[PDB]
Amino acid sequence: QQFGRDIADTTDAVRDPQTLEILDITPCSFGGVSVITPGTNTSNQVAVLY
Amino acid sequence: NVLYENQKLIANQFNSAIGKIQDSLSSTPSALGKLQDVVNHNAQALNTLV
Numbered sequence: 769q770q771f772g773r774d775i776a777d778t779t780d781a782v783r784d785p786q787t788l789e790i791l792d793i794t795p796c797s798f799g800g801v802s803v804i805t806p807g808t809n810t811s812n813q814v815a816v817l818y
Numbered sequence: 819n820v821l822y823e824n825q826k827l828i829a830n831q832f833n834s835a836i837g838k839i840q841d842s843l844s845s846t847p848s849a850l851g852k853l854q855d856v857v858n859h860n861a862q863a864l865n866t867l868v
């Protein structure tokens with residue numbers, strides 16, 4: 769076996785040829801960013817939501 | 819006037835119906851078709867995009 773896969777047809781585990789131990793693959797932390805603000809006529813401050 | 823002359827029988831029948839429906843909600847495995855179907859449709863629609 770060279771590398772693994774999952775249900776979603778994506779790469780999950782990769783074995784390097786240098787050393788017999790295998791390495792998992794998990795992508796970088798991704799997600800939407802949302803803003804929490806009141807009306808501009810009332811205040812000016814904002815809140816950042818991830 | 820018919821309720822107060824048969825209150826014990828009505829209460830016993832209500833308790834028996836509650837027990838029977840509590841047994842039947844777990845005995846039948848196909849009684850939860852709609853929620854399982856819609857969550858399976860959502861999961862399949864999410865999986866087919868990937």
Ligand SMILES: *[C@@H]1O[C@H](CO)[C@@H](O)[C@H](O)[C@H]1NC(C)=O
Nearest residue numbers: 783784785786787788789790
């Ligand atoms: C060959 O692979 C091994 C894996 O540990 C590595 O240590 C070695 O330096 C490699 N040599 C060559 C020919 O690149």
